[model samples]
Target chain A: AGKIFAVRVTHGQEETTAKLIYSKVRTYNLPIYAILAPSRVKGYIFVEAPNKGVVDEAIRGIRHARGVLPGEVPFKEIEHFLEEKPAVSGLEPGDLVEVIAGPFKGQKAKVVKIDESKDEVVVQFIDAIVPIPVTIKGDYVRLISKL
Target chain B: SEKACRHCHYITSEDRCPVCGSRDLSEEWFDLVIIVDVENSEIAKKIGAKVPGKYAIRVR
Candidate 1:
């Protein structure tokens, strides 16, 4: 049996790290194939191993590399298991928050617009770069982390 | 001459730091993290790396 392996890597390490992990997977000589993405910071590896447990073993090996971290590759069998979990809402029009889950995370942003129905909020991140209005899940964001 | 923030991997300039919105920046005092990754790095997470840009892991 085969399943996707979503291993964690350093922030922004998605591409290079994926490449390295892919190389290692190939080196293993297993009939496995893997693909990593920056958007998700996880990879999809396919191989005919003894069992699904092999995902863990492969991850263990991958984690040894710099920036790799332990994370779970959740199964999608359960409905809404990964559904949006909303928190913190009704942000003021000019509220300031940290872009914690988007490309602007770690950067201070000011609320530019809010779509309460969709629970998505837009913020101005970098100055003069066009205030990027990002619509994010409520749960995906939190009060600024104090820069 | 000191390197531009972009070249220094800091994105610091006259008005704002391109990396972060820190209007106040210093070229003389700091260490940095030149990350090839902007998503899955713990250090990047610690310093808050969301985009694939050079960042200052620490500044004093």
Candidate 2:
């Protein structure tokens, strides 16, 4: 991929805004790349296309998208940023772990949910529903064994 | 039916409450799930849910 364009957008930009941006870019019928990532719960949208022009078209249109703030494609030509290989393996369902960090450090927790795509896990500090397997950063937790 | 674990605040349907090992049921206003997984839960910890379940989320 030569000069793949990556567009960074605000987080939690609402469904309408996301759909609008995505639809606008797809209409171009050009070679592009796009992906979504978490941005401090604010929301983030990434797009790789043939050129900045193609990505901009979507960004400009998205500005008017419902519940969306002024969008921007801040970073440019940074493939290395996209090549992030998570060093920490987030816990998965059935994985046993001890809360090594946080106030509950040293307390044993069990993995209940694992969102690998997002690199997060839901662990159990106690036996109950609602928040049994609370989602947390994968790197902050330590996996001991599997259930 | 309201359950009261004289030993623990754990409310349950069975004769034996999960925590504290008690068979005490009270018609009082103590019917709600207790969230115990707080350190791992953002929402639970937000409302001080120590244990996760259908917690009352509030108590009068």
Candidate 3:
């Protein structure tokens, strides 16, 4: 069975790139099974092609089409990308969060303030006696609980 | 010199890799993926990318 592979393309043009590949498949009879242009995943699309060769040929000379990913993507890897997860929703002041990325990963902090327009938050480390509010992106912190 | 992080394959021109803050960097790498948005990027999801930046598809 053909597996799905992630393909990177120009941001905001995923639909156009997918259409180009679809047109190529129709004209060349390429062994492409599906073209998944999920809006949830920006600048990326999933292609169910027989192999990398088919993907390469289909995207060749297509505008806004970047290239195929290095490795094959399992269905599990693609399932979450299809779901919509907003970066700012569910976050609020006085909320507790755990840093999920970079140096502060796994550190528990409390939300002191939020900037919904910028999708950012100011957090204070719970363990620190004199906590300094650290500005971080909304995606960097995972909401622990509402308070 | 431009260096690539072995951890997340993030390419950085600085000495200390900015993406993962890892000093374990390689000068030899290929394939660049410029991610504009991290939240909706499939490649970003695969690489555990949190910030939109230049990333390497393959790091050596």
Candidate 4:
């Protein structure tokens, strides 16, 4: 991994710039460590490569890539944008949660099970005696605390 | 049609709105709010976002 480069990109072309960069890297098998577009709403893309010339090689004649910024980027400057945390990262079964959406909206429940792929959760409502197994997306379950 | 949820505002690609388990549908207008952190996000409170997920801000 080399120092990061800030790349100017056409507005609404962040992903496209990265998309183009990825295939180019694959072609030359050039070891530019990583490519990041941070936000879909931003105009800058990032590239990490062994040197500035390698980045120039990649972006050379690439469409929608505005060009390299003034200098190499420090990780500390771009670090915060890398905090791409998923909503379900910290949840587990038996966690106390309140349903934010659906029929049981605002009702409290304990997580019974979690589906990793679908991002859904199986919950048992605390107030209901029937103990019906209900399925809902985990994102709709607010984590009050884990029990 | 790619449906959006009326109850949860999740972009629905199925019969029941996946996030909220609601089949109720909202007609159109598609844009997304990616909630990275719910507890600390001020926008989350205003838009009624409860958890981390993409939410539709409005729909027809």
Candidate 5:
């Protein structure tokens, strides 16, 4: 009963812009359905709704929402964005990252080594007194600068 | 911090997964899913949109 429409939003405003439409949807109880702002895709967001009229209702006055396009998006076209892979697939030794998800949260570190087999990485704490190295899941580190 | 539940993959601003009631939360989570109006949307059905609100595709 609905089609996915590609709505053009301000290039960097994808998330906040989507959040705005989300609020409009909840506040107005509009017919707008799902909203997707893919990380790989920029300058656009997707909205699932039965009619353009409903999308127009949710998005028109929102900030950072440039406007809705005339074309509709097919599910298969954007399906790849939904797929997930091991977060450590491309991680390598020498990358700079910050420990984002551990007791070491917010600590800066350098990737000392990587265990390809175990989805783990050894990080050298850059800001610590002793420069200790800790092993943690590759997913626990946020890439600060790619290697 | 806005952490994701390691258990149910629900992304909540609070400490626990409202879905599973588990205290596990991690800052390393990716992707976003907003299942707003599931009743009319076909795309959401293919997603974990079996329930509504935001969810992390992978919570690490």
Candidate 6:
């Protein structure tokens, strides 16, 4: 499997931009594995290529191109992002979690509600005068204690 | 009632949210965010939004 990287494009123009990339690669005979412009995510297109060089060459000089992002995105990250899994996904209300990323990182909270379609978890800090629910991505929070 | 999914933030009228398949719905939501393109919108990226549809700015 090849590494995946993100290509930023004009939001509504993802399809068009992807088309441009396809044509460019074909014209130049670059080894681009696949291009995915997920209907769910806008402005960004995912490309699978042998290396960053090929991706760079494929996307170079495209007017709508916003340049490729750095680093190789593993399949694990892609699976979580693209796969529309159950929002609960073994997580339930009252589960304790630790904020892995964002300003609330390191803080512990309890799951109050879950928005499955959005894949968000509403959590409130363990110690707070008034519990203020903070909505964050489910992937960003890890389950510390299950209810 | 118009409800927003607590997971994907999709707005729906049904009891179960279709986008994320979450039944958690909240009517106490404000702000209408209509996402036509997820590829290029900065706000969409900020909110980690992947799907295009009606989303609430904040769902309580």
Q: Mind giving the per-residue lDDT tens digits that candidate 4 earns over A50-143? A: 6788888889778899788769888677555543233455778899899998888999988888764345788899999899989887668789
lDDT (Cα, tens digit) per residue for candidate 2, span B1-60: 545444344455668767556665443422232232334433333333344332321111
Per model, the share of native interface contacts recovered reads 0.00, 0.00, 0.00, 0.00, 0.54, 0.01
lDDT of each: 0.44, 0.46, 0.71, 0.68, 0.76, 0.73
TM-score of 3: 0.42
For B6-30, candidate 4 gives per-residue lDDT tens digits of 6666656678877679877655633
lDDT of predicted model 4: 0.68
Provide the TM-score of chain B versus the true chain B for each model in turn: 0.52, 0.47, 0.82, 0.72, 0.71, 0.86
Cα DockQ of the candidate 2 complex: 0.02
Tell me the TM-score of candidate 6's A chain.
0.53
Best by DockQ: 5
lDDT of 3 at A130: 91
Using TM-score as the yardstick, the better of models 1 and 6 is: 6
Number of clashing residue pairs, candidate 1? 15
Stretches of candidate 4 exceeding 4 Å from the true structure: A26-31, A38-41, A76-86, A98-108, A122-145, B1-60
- Per-model i-RMS: 14.8, 19.5, 13.4, 12.7, 3.5, 12.5
lDDT of 3 by residue, B1-60 (tens): 667786666778887788668987878654444444355455456556677555655454
TM agreement with the true structure for every prediction = 0.27, 0.36, 0.42, 0.48, 0.67, 0.42
Best by TM-score: 5
Candidate 5 positional error at A73, Å: 0.5
Q: Model 4: C-alpha RMSD to truth?
A: 13.1
Candidates 2 and 4 compared by TM-score, better number? 4
- The residue-level lDDT of candidate 1 at B42 comes to 35
| CA lDDT, candidate 3, residue A127 | 88
Residues A1-147, candidate 1: write the lDDT tens digits: 233344445565554554555455556744333232423223332122233455455455564334222343433421122122224455766777776665655777677776643456776765537765766665556665332
Q: What is the TM-score of chain A in candidate 3?
A: 0.54
B13 Cα displacement, candidate 2 (Å) = 37
